[PDB]
């Protein structure tokens, strides 16, 4: 139905499954499919411990922010993506539902600073900014910067600022015996033939 | 010769030097060298030829 905002993305650990990414590749209903680290066409015949799946929504102009080694306002504060094997990135347009709805104060983003966030941490602490020290014009109670502000969207106001629904996967290797594996057939064993095996 | 050992130092030194050189050469086969993994098969089965 609807995922949470960018402050607290839903974090799902998927294990003990039989994954078939083939039914996802052929479905050409995505705006961007920039998956690095693994060639998507050779993903069925490769399985590992488990996956980490999180989902959120961003603007249509910040899609390129989600990539390793990038610098921005969202890639360092809202979601820090480390410079390593971060699976695949999926982003699809959301205009029929997200843009064509009266929930103008349901999608939130942060302008806060001096809060550099390390890879894979969450800061749901919603507090108004009141330093009460020298770096706030020397007066306590002023410079009340609200940490959250809403996506201002209208019915079909453009393309570059349209809401985009983004899911990024994370895979790990050499941590535990493989639990989730693709659909393949198991054959019987042979002895003393110098065979190749998986 | 029967009682006192450690008199054949030179031959032992030669053998140890050769064995240690072979050991470090074999051990050198397990370094990433900046790549993704130290085994060709993993990269072959994970990535694409281009």
Curated annotation (Swiss-Prot), chain A:
Organism: Severe acute respiratory syndrome coronavirus 2
Whole sequence portion shown: 345 to 542 of 1273
Outcome of mutating residue 149 to R: In strain: Omicron/BA.1, Omicron/BA.2, Omicron/BA.2.12.1
Outcome of mutating residue 96 to K: In strain: Omicron/BA.1, Omicron/BA.2, Omicron/BA.2.12.1, Omicron/BA.2.75, Omicron/BA.4, Omicron/BA.5, Omicron/BQ.1.1, Omicron/XBB.1.5, Omicron/EG.5.1
Mutagenesis / variant outcome for changing residue 2 to T: In strain: Omicron/BQ.1.1, Omicron/XBB.1.5, Omicron/EG.5.1
Region (Receptor-binding motif), start-end ranges: 93-164
Outcome of mutating residue 100 to T: In strain: Omicron/BQ.1.1
Effect of residue 112 to L: In strain: Omicron/EG.5.1
Effect of residue 140 to K: In strain: Beta/B.1.351, Eta/B.1.525, Theta/P.3, Iota/B.1.526, B.1.1.318, Gamma/P.1, Zeta/P.2 and Mu/B.1.621; May enhance affinity to human ACE2 receptor
Protein name, entry field: Spike protein S1
Effect of residue 108 to Q: In strain: Omicron/BA.2.12.1
Designated gene of the protein: S
Residue ranges, annotated region (Integrin-binding motif): 59-61
Domain BetaCoV S1-CTD: residue ranges: 1-183
Effect of residue 64 to S: In strain: Omicron/BA.2, Omicron/BA.2.12.1, Omicron/BA.2.75, Omicron/BA.4, Omicron/BA.5, Omicron/BQ.1.1, Omicron/XBB.1.5, Omicron/EG.5.1
Region (Immunodominant HLA epitope recognized by the CD8+): 104-112
Impact when changing residue 134 to K: In strain: Delta/B.1.617.2, Omicron/BA.1, Omicron/BA.2, Omicron/BA.2.12.1, Omicron/BA.2.75, Omicron/BA.4, Omicron/BA.5, Omicron/BQ.1.1, Omicron/XBB.1.5, Omicron/EG.5.1
Annotated S-S bridges: 35-88, 47-181, 136-144
Impact reported for residue 108 to R: In strain: Delta/B.1.617.2, Epsilon/B.1.427/B.1.429, Kappa/B.1.617.1, Lambda/C.37, 19B/501Y, Omicron/BA.4, Omicron/BA.5, Omicron/BQ.1.1; Contributes to cellular immunity evasion and increases infectivity
Known function: Attaches the virion to the cell membrane by interacting with host receptor, initiating the infection. The major receptor is host ACE2. When S2/S2' has been cleaved, binding to the receptor triggers direct fusion at the cell membrane. When S2/S2' has not been cleaved, binding to the receptor results in internalization of the virus by endocytosis using host TFRC and GRM2 and leading to fusion of the virion membrane with the host endosomal membrane. Alternatively, may use NRP1/NRP2 and integrin as entry receptors.
Effect of residue 149 to Y: Reduced host ACE2-binding affinity in vitro
Subunit details: Binds to host ACE2. RBD also interacts with the N-linked glycan on 'Asn-90' of ACE2. Cleavage of S generates a polybasic C-terminal sequence on S1 that binds to host Neuropilin-1 (NRP1) and Neuropilin-2 (NRP2) receptors. Interacts with host integrin alpha-5/beta-1 (ITGA5:ITGB1) and with ACE2 in complex with integrin alpha-5/beta-1 (ITGA5:ITGB1). May interact via cytoplasmic c-terminus with M protein. May interact (via N-terminus) with host bilirubin and biliverdin, thereby preventing antibody binding to the SARS-CoV-2 spike NTD via an allosteric mechanism.
Effect of residue 142 to P: In strain: Omicron/XBB.1.5, Omicron/EG.5.1
Residue ranges of the region described as Receptor-binding domain (RBD): 1-197
Reported impact of residue 108 to R: Increased resistance to neutralizing antibodies. Decreases HLA binding to NF9 epitope. Increased binding affinity to human ACE2
Mutation effect (residue 73 to N): In strain: Beta/B.1.351, Omicron/BA.1, Omicron/BA.2, Omicron/BA.2.12.1, Omicron/BA.2.75, Omicron/BA.4, Omicron/BA.5, Omicron/BQ.1.1, Omicron/XBB.1.5, Omicron/EG.5.1; May enhance affinity to human ACE2 receptor
Renumbered residue ranges of the record's region Disordered: 111-146, 175-197
Impact upon substituting residue 142 to V: In strain: Omicron/BA.4, Omicron/BA.5, Omicron/BQ.1.1
Effect of residue 140 to Q: In strain: Kappa/B.1.617.1
């Amino acid at each position: 139905t609807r995922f949470a905002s960018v402050y607290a993305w839903n974090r799902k650990r998927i294990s003990n499954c039989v994954a078939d990414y083939s039914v996802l590749y052929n479905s050409a209903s995505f705006s961007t499919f920039k998956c690095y680290g693994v060639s998507p066409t050779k993903l069925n015949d490769l399985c590992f411990t488990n996956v980490y799946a999180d989902s959120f929504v961003i603007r249509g102009d910040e899609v390129r922010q989600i990539a390793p080694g990038q610098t921005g306002k969202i890639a360092d504060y809202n979601y820090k993506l480390p410079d390593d094997f971060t699976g695949c990135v999926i982003a699809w347009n959301s205009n029929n539902l997200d843009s064509k709805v009266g929930g103008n104060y349901n999608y939130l983003y942060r302008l806060f600073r001096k809060s550099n966030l390390k890879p894979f941490e969450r800061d749901i602490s919603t507090e108004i900014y009141q330093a009460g020290s020298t770096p706030c014009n020397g007066v306590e109670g002023f410079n009340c910067y609200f940490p959250l502000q809403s996506y201002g969207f209208q019915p079909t106001y453009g393309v570059g600022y349209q809401p985009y629904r983004v899911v990024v996967l994370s895979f790990e290797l050499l941590h535990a015996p493989a639990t989730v594996c693709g659909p393949k057939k198991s054959t019987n064993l042979v002895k003393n033939k110098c065979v190749n095996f998986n | 010769l029967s009682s006192t050992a450690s008199a054949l130092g030179k031959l032992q030194d030669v053998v140890n030097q050769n064995a240690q050189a072979l050991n470090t050469l074999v051990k050198q086969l397990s370094s990433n060298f900046g790549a993704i993994s130290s085994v060709l098969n993993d990269i072959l089965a994970r990535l694409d030829p281009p």
